Every structure is written in C-alpha cells, then in structure tokens.
C-alpha cells in the first residue's frame, strides 16, 4: 500500500528471540512430529509425537526424582509446569516416567481415547495433553496432528504417544522461530481447569 | 529521560533521543531507534505485544549482565519475573484468537509507521498471523490508516505554542 | 475505526459512527448506540463494569458464531477466556463492597449522560445497588455531575482548530 | 434530577445477560431457599438450602466419577470449581457425593457448626460453604439465611444442608436476573484462602 | 469530586480541594494534602507505589470503621482485598530489583515536588533504597527533573482558555 | 539539590504502616537472627534463625490441627501461606510441627543442605525456605545470613534451623519498620514454582 495519509513506511521488524536463550526457555517446531525447548547452553527438551513407545512402566518415579535428586534442574521445572497444566489427568497408567538414567523421559499415552476413530470425543485425557502440548509450543504447532481452527478441544488425533526427553541443543528450530511465549503461556495463569474434585 | 517499563534504575537508553533495538534484539541489521516520546507509551499503555517483548528483553539483559547465570538459567527467577513483566491477559487474548480462527500475534513480527520525512515512528505493533502465515497489508488495512491518524495527531499536538 | 477491546479482527461495528448494543444485549428495545470516541475508552481504561460486560458479550458472539458449541458450552474455553477478558480486580472490588455495606455494582444496570441536543453519550457506568436494591439518583448525585463535567470538557476539546 | 449542567438525560440500560447462556454459566435466585445455575440449552444446577438430607453416605465417590466417567461435563467443572473455592474444608464426613445415577448430587452438611445457636463461631466449615455459596450466586443471595452486612464471615445460619443437584432449565430466575458474575467471581483469582498445611 | 481508587461510595476527602494524609497515615506531623487533580492520577495510572499504599489505607479505614473486627483481623477478608487492591505486578517488580542489586521501593518513603509558590504537588513517588539504605537525591537526580517537567506542563495546561 | 527547574521542594513522607495493624499482618526485623509478624492487638509471630532445635519430632500434626482445632486463627493462615510458598519441599523430615500446647511451633531444619560448606548448592530445600523467609519479611531481611545481591538462590546460609512460634506483640521492630508488604508478596501470585510432579 506504500504511504499512509502522509509519507509513512511500514518498516517491519522480526525479533531475534534466540538471544533470550540464557534466561528463559524457548520453544519451536522442527517438523510435524517434533517440537523442541531450549533451556540453556547446548541443552533442551525434545517433544516427540509418535506411534511407538519407549517406556512400558506404569509408574512415575517422582518419589525418587524429588528425593534422590540426580536430575537436571530447570528441565524438571519445565516438565512439572507442563504436566500440571493438563486438565483432568490423574495418572490412568499413562504419564509414567523413568529417571533411572533415562532422566526426564516421560510419556503421555494419547491412545487413551480408547476404541478407534474419534472415541471419547470431548472427554479423553489425550485432548488435555494435546491442548497443553499446543501451548508449550504454539503458532508452529499447527502442523502437528491437531487440525482445523474453530474446533476447540475434542481434537482426537492419530498419534498414540507424546514422549518427552532431554536432548542436546542442535539447530532443531527449522519450522518455526524459537519463542518464550509457549512456556510463558503455560506458566502464566494456567487457568487451572482442574475437573477433579 | 526515564522510563517506568524498565527494571533498570534509568541505567541508559532513555535519554539519547530514543531507545534503540540492537542487532541482538533484531534478526536484521541494527539500531532500529524509536523516539523517547513513542517508547514512553510502554510506560503506561498496559496492553501491547511490542512493549511486552521490550520488557522481556530488558530483563534478559539485566539478568545476564548482573547474575552471569552459569549452568542454570534460574527458571525460578523467571517465574517471579513473569508475574512482574508479561501482561498475562494479552497472551491469553492471542491464544484465544488462535483457537477461534481470528488473526493473532505470535510475537515475532511487528510493523510501524515511519514518517521518513522527519524520522518519527509510531512504535511497532504486531503484524499478526492467520491460517499458518502472515497477513497482507491490504487486509490489515484500516488499522494502519488509524495508526497514521494517531501520528498525524501527534505531529500537530507537537506544536509547542499550543495544542 | 478499530478497537483494542475486541477479540475480532475489526470485523465490524467499529466504523459506522459508533458501536450499537442490540436487542439481545439489552432487555429493552434496541440499538443503544455509543459513539466510537466514547466506546474507545474501553480500549485502555482497564477499569469499568460496562466495558467488561461489553467484552464478555463480544466473546459470546464470536464463540457462538464460530464454534457452534453443540451439547457442551466448552467451559474450559471460558476458563481461558476469563483470564483474557474479565478484569478480576474489579469484580473483587464489587464483591468487597457488598461485604462491607458499600453500594456496589451487580452488573445489570447502567446509566449514562445523553446530550440529546447533539446525541453524544458518556458511555454507561454502573448504577449500583445497596440494601437489596437500586440507589436513588439523588444520592448517586455528584458522580453524575462529575460525568457531565467530563462530557462538557470533551465537547470543548472537540473543537478541531485547537483544545 | 432531570438535566445535569447542560441538557443531559440518564437514559439507563438493563443488560440481557440471558443471551450469554450458550457460552458460560449463569446463576440466579428463585426464592429464599433456592438458587440456580444455567449451563446450557434446557439444563443447569439446582442449589438447595434445606434442613433435610438426601445422601446419607459419607463417601464422595470421585474416584469413580473421574475414572468411569458417565458424568456430565461442564456441570462437573462447575461443582469442582465451587467445591475447591471453599476454604479449610477437607471432608469431615460432610461433602459426600453419589454419582451412581444421582449424578452430580453432593451435599455440604452445614450442621457441622455443632452444638446449637452460634456454635463454632468464625470457625465452622459451614461458613466456608456459605461464603462460597454466596459467590456462586450473589447480589440476590441476600435472601438466603445470611443476614446483615458489615458482618464478614461468622455467619452461622440455620439451614443444615446445602444440596447441589442437576435440573432442567425451567424459568427458575424469579428473584434475581441471571448473571455470569457469580461463576466468574469464584473462578477468577479464587483467593485460595487454603488454611490447611 | 469522586475517585475510582476508593472503596467508599464517595464518602469524603474527594471534594475539599484535595485528599489529606492524616497523622495516622504519616509518622511525622499531619495533613499532607494533595490536590484532587493530582490524587486523581491514582484513579487510572495502575502502576504507582504511593497509590497502592493509598488504597491499602483506605481499605484499612473502612474495614475497621465498619466491621470493628474484635479478636481476629479477618485475614480471609484481606486475601480477597489484596486481589482487589494491591497491584501484584508492581510488588514483584520491586522484589526483583532487590534480588538484582537494583534500587527498589520498600514502600516506606516517598518524595514529591512541592511548588510552594502556589502549593501544588506532584504526588509522592517512592524514594527507593539500595545496599541496605536510602538513595541520595544526587543520584536519584533526573527523575526529579523529569517530575518537575511534568508539573511545569500541568501548570501551563492549567490555563483554562486553552492548552 | 534544593529547587528543580522552578521553585520546588522534595518534602518527603514516611508512612506509618503500623496503623494498618488491625486489618492485615505486618512484618519487621528486630536483629540478625530475629524477625517478627504482628497479627492483631498484642499478638504476632516470632521468626527465629538459630543453630539449636526445639522440636525433635518428625511429624507435622496438621491432621490434629485442622480437626481438633484448638489453634489460633489468622496465625494458622499466615503459617500455611508461608509454608506453601516454599518451592520443592515435601517434608523430608524437616518442617515437623507440634500443636499440643506449643501451638503454632514449627521448624524448617535448614541443615538439610547436608555435608558442610556450600553443599547442595542451588538444590537444597533450605534455600527454598530462605527465599520464602526473605519474602515474609523483606527489605530488612538483608542482615539475616543471606548475603550479597546479584546472587539469586543458592544462598546456602550457616543457620541450621528456622523456627516459627507465637509471641506477644512487644516492641520488636527495632531494625526495620513494620510492613504489610512481606505478607502481601507471599500471598499475591505466589509464582507457584512447584518443582514436584
Ligand atoms: C510466526 O509465524 C510465522 C509464519 O508462519 C513463522 O515464520 C516462519 O519461520 C521459519 C523458521 O524461521 C521459516 O523457515 C525457513 O524456511 C526457508 C525456506 O525457504 C523458502 O521459503 C522462504 C520463505 O520466506 C523464501 O524466502 C526462500 O527463498 C525459499 O523459497 C528455509 O530455507 C530456512 O532454512 C534456514 O534456517 C534454518 C533455521 O533453523 C536452518 O536450520 C537452515 O539450515 C537454513 O539456514 C527455514 O527453514 C519460515 O520460512 C517462516 N515463514 C514465513 C511466512 O515467514 C514464525 O517463525 C512464527 N514465529 C514464532 C516465534 O513462532
Ligand atoms: C441487581 O439487583 C436488582 C435489585 O434487587 C435486581 O432486580 C430485580 O430482578 C428481579 C428478576 O428480574 C425482578 O423480579 C420481578 O418482580 C415482579 C414483581 O412485580 C411488582 O414489582 C415490580 C418492581 O419493578 C413492579 O414494576 C410491578 O408493577 C409489581 O408491583 C414480577 O412480576 C416479575 O415476574 C415476571 O418475570 C419472571 C422472571 O423469571 C417470570 O418468571 C414471571 O412469570 C413474570 O413474567 C419478577 O419476579 C425484581 O422486580 C427486580 N427488582 C428491582 C428493584 O428492579 C437485579 O436482578 C440484580 N441483577 C443481577 C444480574 O443479579
Ligand atoms: C526501608 O529501608 C530503610 C533504610 O534501611 C529502613 O529505615 C530504618 O528503620 C529503622 C526502624 O524504624 C530505624 O531504626 C532506628 O535507629 C535509631 C538509631 O539512632 C541513630 O541513627 C539514626 C539514623 O537516622 C540517627 O538519626 C540517630 O541520631 C542515631 O545516630 C534508634 O535510636 C531507633 O530506636 C527507637 O525506635 C525503636 C523502634 O522499635 C524503639 O524500640 C526504640 O526504643 C527507640 O525509640 C531505631 O532503632 C533506622 O534508623 C532506619 N534507617 C534509615 C537509614 O532511615 C525502613 O524501616 C525500611 N522500611 C520498611 C517498611 O521496611
Ligand atoms: C525510520 O526511518 C529513518 C529514515 O529513513 C531510518 O533512518 C535511516 O536508517 C538507515 C539504516 O540504518 C541509515 O543508513 C546508513 O547509511 C550509511 C551510508 O550512507 C551507512 O554507513 C550506515 O551504516 C547506515 O546503513 C540512514 O542514514 C538513516 N537515515 C537518516 C536520516 O539518519 C530509521 O532507521 C527508520 N526506523 C527506525 C525504527 O529507526
Ligand atoms: C441518546 O439520545 C438520542 C436522542 O434522543 C437517542 O436517539 C433517538 O432514539 C429513539 C429510539 O430508538 C428514536 O426513535 C425512533 O422513532 C421512529 C418514529 O418516529 C421509529 O420508527 C424508530 O423505530 C425509533 O423508535 C429517535 O429517532 C432517535 N433520535 C434521533 C435524533 O435520531 C439515542 O437512542 C439515545 N441513547 C443511545 C445510547 O443511543
Ligand atoms: C506543600 O507546600 C505548602 C507550602 O509550604 C505546605 O503548606 C504549609 O504547611 C505548614 C505545615 O502544615 C503550615 O504551617 C502552619 O503554621 C501555623 C503557625 O504559623 C500552625 O498553627 C499550623 O499548625 C501549621 O504548622 C503552613 O501554613 C502551610 N502553608 C500555607 C501557605 O498554607 C504543604 O503542607 C506542603 N505539602 C503537602 C503535601 O501538603
Ligand atoms: C499405553 O496404552 C496402551 C493401550 O494402547 C491402545 O489402546 C487400548 C484402548 C487398547 O485397544 C490397546 O490394544 C491399544 O494398543 C496400554 O496397553 C493395553 O491397555 C488396555 C487397557 O486400556 C489393556 O486391556 C491391555 O491388556 C494393555 N495391553 C497389554 C499388552 O497388556 C499400555 O499398557 C499403556 N502403557 C502405559 C505405560 O501406560
Ligand atoms: C450430617 O451431619 C449429621 C450431624 O447433624 C447435627 O449436628 C451434630 C453435631 C449432632 O448434634 C446431630 O445430632 C445433629 O443432627 C451427622 O450425624 C451425626 O454426627 C455426629 C457427629 O457430629 C455423631 O456423633 C452422630 O452419631 C451422627 N448421627 C447418627 C444417627 O449416627 C451425619 O452423619 C452427617 N452426614 C453426612 C453424610 O455427613
Ligand atoms: C534435623 O536435621 C538433623 C540433621 O542435622 C545435620 O545435618 C545432617 C546432614 C548430619 O550431618 C547431622 O549430623 C547434622 O547435625 C537430623 O538429624 C540426623 O539426620 C541424618 C540424616 O540427614 C541421620 O543420618 C542422623 O542419624 C540424624 N541424627 C540422629 C542423632 O539420629 C534431625 O533428625 C532433623 N530433625 C527433624 C525434626 O527433622
Ligand atoms: C497409529 O496407529 C493407529 C492404529 O492403531 C492409526 O489409527 C487410524 O489409522 C487410519 C488409517 O491410517 C486413519 O484413517 C484413522 O484416522 C486413524 N485413527 C485416528 C484416531 O485418527 C493411526 O493413524 C497411526 N498414527 C499415525 C500418526 O500414523
Ligand atoms: C540426557 O541426560 C543424560 C544424563 O546426563 C545424558 O547421559 C550422560 O552422558 C555423559 C556424556 O559424557 C556420560 O558421561 C554420562 O555417564 C551419561 N549419564 C547417564 C545416566 O547415562 C544423556 O546423553 C542426555 N541426552 C542427550 C541426547 O544428550
Ligand atoms: C421455592 O419454590 C419451590 C418450587 O415452587 C418450592 O418447592 C416446592 O414446595 C411445595 C410446597 O407445597 C412442595 O409440595 C414441593 O414438593 C417442593 N418442590 C421441590 C422440588 O422442593 C420451595 O419450597 C420454595 N421455597 C421457598 C423459600 O418458598
Ligand atoms: C433446622 O433445625 C434446627 C434445629 O435442629 C433449627 O435450629 C434453631 O431453631 C430455633 C427456633 O426456630 C431458632 O430460633 C435458632 O436460631 C435455630 N438455630 C440457628 C443456628 O439459627 C433451625 O432453625 C432449622 N432451620 C430452618 C431454616 O428451619
Ligand atoms: C439428572 O441427570 C440424569 C442423568 O441423565 C437424568 O436421568 C435420566 O433421564 C432420562 C430421561 O429420558 C432417562 O432416559 C435416563 O435413563 C435417566 N438416567 C438415570 C441415571 O436415571 C435426570 O433426570 C436429571 N435430573 C433432572 C431433574 O433432569
Ligand atoms: C535479638 O534480641 C533477643 C532479645 O533481646 C536476643 O535473645 C536473648 O539473648 C540473651 C543474651 O544474653 C539470652 O539470655 C536470652 O535468653 C535470649 N532470649 C530469647 C527469647 O532468645 C537475641 O539473641 C538477639 N539476636 C541477635 C543477633 O543479637
Ligand atoms: C552452626 O554450626 C555449624 C557447624 O555444625 C557452623 O558451620 C560452619 O562454621 C564455620 C566456622 O564458624 C564457618 O566458617 C562455615 O561457613 C559454617 N558453615 C556454613 C554453611 O556457612 C555454622 O556456622 C553455625 N552457624 C551459626 C550461625 O553460628
Ligand atoms: C502461645 O499461645 C499459647 C496458647 O494460648 C499461650 O499459652 C497460654 O497462656 C495463658 C496465659 O493466661 C494460659 O492461661 C494458657 O493455659 C496457656 N495455654 C497453653 C496451651 O499452655 C502462650 O503463652 C503463647 N506464647 C506467648 C509467648 O505468648
């Protein structure tokens, strides 16, 4: 449109959010099944959407993680923030975790929609997980299996598991630019949306 | 020249005509400098994606410079800082817009009107995205025209004698 | 004509001289139309019972129109929306006033000054209740007079040449 | 007073909050012992203040409600929001619930003020329940047994039970106009006021 | 003369030229009176340590006068009141500054510019502390000069005919 | 500096926050090892930093405190607010409490940094306790063993215990003026900083 009721240019900006890396986590998208969180120098989390499973335990050994420690700080805070932002989740077998050398490895088991095709539509804990996932990383989360706007909740995707693991900070942010906003959105307010009791 | 949006004790960049965004704030080039009377809007508006990013960068600079923060990023400092800095309400409005198919700010891109005749600027405002990408200026439209009206008003109210 | 208080991408009712409250916003009659320069106050004031209801209605319209929402009302969307929309601090102030025997807003009734000579309005402000019912305009008093002073000021500052 | 320092009229408004029915709950008062919450088309909750009792169980079978499901969504969220907004309540027998066909039926047992006349003045869980009740629906809550302003907390009313059940949405809002504000007040902030630990 | 920052229904001290801080608000002497046009800033600024203390005192007065509050202080009323009254975001900013070695407000001491020629005041702003004690006016510096500019502007805009 | 671009004086104020005593708690500093909270007429809490121990129980008898009552209201709310503002604390033996005539007496056992010298640097629950302590009372908290700014968290002080007890309201606030701000800071937002799960 050039000028706007006088001589004015738009002169746009694109912020280098990467330089915020040393103080708060930055999330991004790599491809359809992978999202990442940078938490410090050469370190961060890998968020994987898959149909396979790594952890067959039904226990989440938090009593060890918070007593024996031996875990990475900050990465633990991020996963706890994420986990506790999910509505209506208790455990229900899903969300088991193993810190005995696998450290932060935790998995959500989205398959608990049960049956097949949309199953527990608008009720599955899987949607609670997906909605939290899409806040942890957002904007660039649209290429995940969540598809279509104006369709809030009741997503019912085809991936069976969400697996979260610690990784190195390689140049993973190929689909979307890194941003502190996802983490800040989960952290800020939360909205509680407890359901339970 | 002091600001209320800053955490610093008027350490700098509030006096030399304006506040400059450096090459580590920007991906492209350097020194996008916004006049102090424009920047000062972030002192009280309480609802602007650009101003919220500005405070977040100011924090980052102070936190790194003064704390060093080896090994850990002090995520717990951040939890305190966000309640102090991020305008939660706005973040949620942009989140709802994404849910609702309404163009929303993903905070990476901003636009402003630059009156290149004199060099005055409006401050950045978020460009917005929808359907996975950025909006055209042709649909963005009227909001630009409205921002121009505001700059026009300022240039007329700029008169020192009156207005 | 764009607003910041709206969730919509300037979809409508920000340009035709003002924003109209329809017969489904109002219990009585229709089209109570507030000039855009008055309505725009809701863009930044950040503390007004009327403006808070206005945002809540704007949400409702968008949520129904775009989501349909059969069977369930998506209460979880609301939980997100309130943090984005409702000015929690004000709600609690009215709650305290009820506790304390101080007239408070229960959000159903509003009043405004209508300069019927020209048709300009002040925007609605809450009428307030105490002791189970509405207050008299005779005790409400001075706040009306003060609102009139504000409209008087606007009509004088309305002069385009200066003021 | 007619005109106000020029020619001005008051021209008052009365908002039709009912049209907000399809997106968020609306609470109202019917009479001294009854309050209601609309949650959707022809559906909502009935809040009853009584001296009788329907549920003699001392169990709140939430482990079934959140595992077997078979419950109405949204109505569950409202009761959980309400319940968790009560300060200092644990269970103390009171607040048992039965979802085995009675669905949302839950009751608070306000009689745990003990003794008689004002008893555990400024300490009973009953006041925690009454204060939460008067936020769930408010403005028109004044005809409930809570009586007198400037007397915060230490209400000590004569009803023995608060019973919450699912109802149809009949034209119940005879004493006060429906409003989203009660729910929003409980939801927003909460104030925590935990007491416990 | 009415205020929005007050919980009272315009009970008093909003009309007699200004709002006075009494000897029970102040440790020293009595009646520090701030003109109503200055005090009114607390109605909408939404970010000022002095205004936040002012609301807290207003609450205290109403709570004691109307509730009596024998035996217990009704801490639960306070929990409601703070969400209604205290500007959480500002408190956290001062907390971060303490963490960060940046001068911060501990809320006990305030300063203002008093144009003793006419008696107008700027309203108190926090004096700030660092390294366990109060700052010198010589390092505080420019913020005072900036506050003076604001009062100068008001005195010129005070002209009724125009400006 | 005298005048400021016209004739202006600074005319400073010093607020008498003590007069706020009857509605909300006020915290202050007495000396290096002692801080206090006023909660009402002639009553408040004593916060003691010491190397000795009064309570050798490893139980926190909250199940009695919140069931048998027999405890002071408001003082209980303050300690619960304080306690629950501590990040990552579970119990870990520390934070035992005894209300059987000792009423509010609770102690935090800061010695769980283990070893000696800085030990579990940036990880001990003791720092979680110290940071909460320094919010309960702040400004004048600098003379406590926390020393040096620009050194966030990882404080690792030499006191072994934080003991909180009920006291009379004597003129304790000798080092710093009483202020509602400490309590308000803990109460407001909290920041959650949960860590656990
Ligand atoms: C807010 O929303 C916007 C809109 O979707 C997001 O913008 C995208 O951001 C990503 C990541 O930065 C961009 O991805 C890049 O795509 C290039 C493809 O090249 C073709 O398309 C571009 C489009 O502009 C043409 O200019 C070009 O000529 C080609 O036709 C890749 O080549 C890029 O690779 C390089 O960077 C990566 C970074 O990790 C390196 O690993 C590579 O080695 C290489 O150096 C890159 O993949 C995408 O193009 C942007 N889209 C648009 C429309 O601008 C924002 O990121 C989002 N913001 C936030 C914070 O979430
Ligand atoms: C904020 O606070 C105000 C003040 O208390 C509340 O206002 C009341 O709202 C209720 C519900 O809408 C009103 O109840 C109605 O009372 C009528 C009684 O008629 C006599 O009194 C009126 C008083 O204005 C005279 O005009 C009339 O001539 C009579 O002398 C009933 O006839 C009404 O019944 C009709 O509506 C109900 C709605 O459910 C239908 O079921 C009935 O079949 C019938 O059609 C009704 O009961 C009350 O009068 C209002 N009081 C005042 C002073 O205005 C607000 O509701 C409250 N706002 C919120 C959101 O909480
Ligand atoms: C914000 O931060 C400031 C800066 O640190 C704190 O200000 C201090 O507050 C304390 C408590 O009010 C003051 O303590 C007093 O010290 C006196 C020492 O006297 C010498 O030093 C003063 C310094 O001004 C000289 O004027 C004097 O001539 C001496 O050389 C004591 O004599 C005082 O004792 C009296 O009051 C106590 C109150 O409990 C009584 O018990 C005693 O019996 C006696 O009557 C007192 O101990 C301290 O001096 C202040 N420092 C400064 C630099 O001003 C703020 O309190 C803090 N605000 C908040 C809310 O936290
Ligand atoms: C708002 O508009 C003004 C006016 O166009 C912008 O100022 C201009 O910015 C460019 C790029 O920084 C300057 O170019 C310089 O060119 C010399 C060589 O000629 C080179 O050595 C410098 O490194 C630089 O590239 C240009 O001189 C400058 N114009 C004026 C009059 O000073 C301004 O950058 C725009 N927006 C913002 C937010 O700053
Ligand atoms: C503020 O005051 C103005 C001026 O009084 C109000 O405008 C007036 O509103 C009424 C009712 O809507 C209009 O009456 C119309 O009468 C015709 C028949 O004559 C009928 O067919 C229409 O349906 C309608 O009832 C009246 O014409 C209109 N006045 C003017 C000059 O246009 C205004 O409604 C008041 N407040 C707000 C917030 O709008
Ligand atoms: C802002 O500056 C004005 C002007 O200096 C201050 O007003 C002055 O305040 C003092 C102390 O309250 C008044 O002194 C009085 O002296 C008589 C004896 O002469 C005594 O009986 C009274 O009890 C009082 O001590 C002084 O008259 C008054 N000046 C004027 C022109 O009225 C004002 O207090 C300063 N700041 C604020 C926030 O009020
Ligand atoms: C992770 O989830 C699987 C369930 O995965 C799918 O969905 C189920 C509803 C069912 O149709 C499975 O066949 C699908 O593969 C858990 O495995 C089964 O869980 C069901 C109960 O839902 C049980 O009856 C089966 O016996 C389980 N399978 C076997 C071989 O025993 C799996 O245990 C979950 N793992 C974790 C750690 O939560
Ligand atoms: C609901 O509460 C009643 C208690 O109701 C009243 O208040 C009591 C303090 C006592 O005076 C009762 O007589 C009053 O009717 C519970 O019933 C009794 O509870 C007390 C302990 O408080 C116990 O000693 C009695 O034995 C109980 N009554 C009988 C017949 O056993 C009742 O159990 C509560 N129900 C639920 C589901 O919580
Ligand atoms: C309070 O803490 C002490 C621990 O205090 C110090 O730090 C320890 C790491 C160790 O070095 C002690 O010697 C120091 O005095 C608890 O007492 C001991 O705890 C350790 C486990 O950490 C255990 O092995 C010892 O046997 C305990 N001491 C004795 C005599 O049994 C003490 O129990 C804690 N008290 C409470 C109520 O929590
Ligand atoms: C993971 O495996 C399941 C089967 O166990 C796949 O489920 C369905 O597959 C068909 C055929 O591809 C689709 O048309 C259905 O829509 C799928 N179910 C759902 C709920 O969408 C599932 O597609 C596999 N997931 C992925 C991502 O490959
Ligand atoms: C996730 O964290 C673990 C724990 O630090 C990493 O595994 C360690 O790698 C170093 C490499 O020098 C070894 O010395 C340690 O013995 C390993 N620890 C364990 C428990 O095996 C792991 O590599 C990290 N994941 C990624 C992708 O970097
Ligand atoms: C509020 O209105 C309801 C419905 O009209 C009253 O409840 C009924 O009262 C009649 C009285 O003869 C009983 O026969 C019905 O069995 C009751 N029905 C239900 C569902 O309880 C209620 O009593 C009224 N409350 C007040 C205070 O008047
Ligand atoms: C429910 O039953 C109880 C008795 O078990 C009634 O308690 C008292 O009744 C007398 C006489 O009516 C009143 O003057 C007292 O004030 C009542 N107690 C309390 C705490 O107020 C109680 O009134 C009955 N409740 C209702 C609403 O009928
Ligand atoms: C509260 O919810 C229950 C559960 O839906 C309602 O009871 C059902 O009513 C339908 C009517 O067609 C029957 O077909 C179902 O079999 C009933 N379910 C059960 C578990 O009995 C109940 O009517 C609702 N309450 C009110 C007042 O509407
Ligand atoms: C802070 O002041 C208190 C009270 O004056 C000191 O506590 C007393 O110290 C004397 C020293 O002879 C003992 O005999 C008392 O038994 C102590 N009383 C109590 C209740 O502990 C305290 O030691 C002072 N702290 C500092 C750092 O000086
Ligand atoms: C409490 O006792 C411990 C020993 O059990 C003291 O620990 C160290 O003491 C030396 C010598 O005074 C110091 O130089 C060390 O810095 C202390 N440890 C730590 C973590 O600082 C401890 O000083 C005693 N505490 C107090 C306040 O007296
Ligand atoms: C802490 O609270 C307890 C409980 O009230 C106080 O101890 C009581 O003191 C009165 C004094 O008249 C005695 O009659 C009570 O019998 C005592 N109660 C118990 C359980 O022993 C204690 O004094 C308070 N602490 C301080 C320092 O005041």
Residue numbers in the entry:
A (entry chain C), D (entry chain A), F (entry chain B): 59 to 255
B (entry chain c), C (entry chain a), E (entry chain b): 260 to 422
Reported in the publication:
The LASV glycoprotein complex (GPC) mediates viral entry and is the sole target for neutralizing antibodies. In its mature, native form, GPC is a trimer of heterotrimers comprised of the receptor-engaging subunit GP1; the transmembrane-spanning subunit GP2, which contains the GPC’s fusion peptide at its N terminus; and the stable signal peptide (SSP), which remains non-covalently complexed near the membrane-proximal region of GP2 post-cleavage. The GPC is expressed as a single polypeptide precursor before being proteolytically processed by signal peptidase (SPase)21 followed by site-1 protease (S1P). We present the development and characterization of prefusion-stabilized, trimeric GPCs of LASV lineages II, V, and VII, revealing structural conservation despite sequence diversity.
We focus on LASV lineages of public health concern including lineage II, one of the most common lineages that circulates widely in southern Nigeria; lineage V, which circulates in Mali and has decreased pathogenicity compared with lineage IV; and lineage VII, a newly described lineage isolated from a nosocomial infection in Togo with comparable pathogenicity to lineage IV. The resulting soluble constructs feature sequences of circulating lineages II (LII; strain NIG08-A41), V (LV; strain Soromba-R), and VII (LVII; strain Togo/2016/7082). Using the prototypical LIV GPC as reference, we note RMSDs for pruned and all sequence-aligned pair as follows: 0.78 and 1.9 (LII), 0.85 and 2.0 (LV), and 0.73 and 2.4 Å (LVII). While 12.1F maintained binding to all GPCs tested, 19.7E showed minimal binding to LV GPC and weaker relative binding to all other lineages. In the unbound state, LV residues 112–114 (gold star) extend further away from the β-sheet surface and would need to be displaced by an average of 2.1 Å to adopt the same conformation. Additionally, the D114 of LV GPC likely disrupts the electrostatic complementarity of N114 with the surrounding S29, S36, and S37 residues, resulting in the minimal binding of 19.7E to LV (bottom). Indeed, the D114N mutation restored binding of LV GPC-I53-50A to immobilized 19.7E, validating our structural observations and defining the molecular determinant of Soromba-R GPC’s resistance to 19.7E binding.
